[PDB]
């Protein structure tokens with residue numbers, strides 16, 4: 671009795687893999703996050719929820735990495751990905767635009783989200799306090815739709831904004847890979863994949879999307 675267009679599927683553990691393929695490249699670029707949630711280059715070509723005695727069970731919330739699923743006219747597809755950590759579900763905002771989510775017997779409703787920062791979480795406040803150390807290599811737990819989950823490793827570059835510096839990864843995945851977690855050597859999630867810029871030489875770069 672707990673049904674939505676969208677649901678999530680636990681698909682992998684949150685881990686640092688050692689046999690992980692090295693890749694990407696470390697760029698510095700000057701950017702600015704507008705109030706829509708789009709990063710812009712130098713000359714380019716949020717609210718809480720009230721969420722009371724609900725008519726359905728609460729969702730699953732087992733820790734781990736997840737696929738976000740939904741169906742279109744031609745049947746199912748992966749809308750995005752996310753991480754379940756300390757009982758909350760974390761993803762980019764553009765993945766579900768706040769849509770409710772089925773997880774097992776129950777259902778997860780959004781808690782907090784910011785359109786500007788493109789972040790969203792379900793069933794409690796943002797749990798991911800860990801954050802890029804500024805200099806070490808990271809791993810993306812790439813939850814590409816249709817593919818097996820793999821870790822890829824990259825040395826992040828940086829987005830140079832007026833608000834300050836942010837790590838950025840030069841990795842290019844399909845739109846359903848948004849909300850894939852990025853971990854550090856200790857297996858902490860230091861951010862999420864999927865909001866970034868397309869460079870003028872054509873390369874896509876994602877910010878390590880994260881809190882504050």
Ligand SMILES: N=C(N)N[C@H]1CC[C@H](CNC(=O)[C@H](CCCCN)NC(=O)[C@H](CCCCN)NC(=O)Cc2ccc(Cl)c(Cl)c2)CC1
Pocket residue numbers: 706707708709710711714763764785787788842843844845846848864865866867868873874
């Ligand atoms: N573009 C390449 N080469 N690769 C993938 C593109 C889709 C993206 C998923 N992210 C996204 O769709 C987010 C949505 C941001 C909304 C903010 N709240 N877009 C982005 O991170 C960038 C930056 C926006 C333009 C610069 N001002 N947009 C894009 O990359 C545009 C785009 C190109 C192709 C597709 Cl299929 C799609 Cl769906 C979108 C993963 C990388």
Ligand SMILES: [Cl-]
Pocket residue numbers: 682683684733734735
């Ligand atoms: Cl785990």
Ligand code: NI
Pocket residue numbers: 805806
């Ligand atoms: Ni060091």
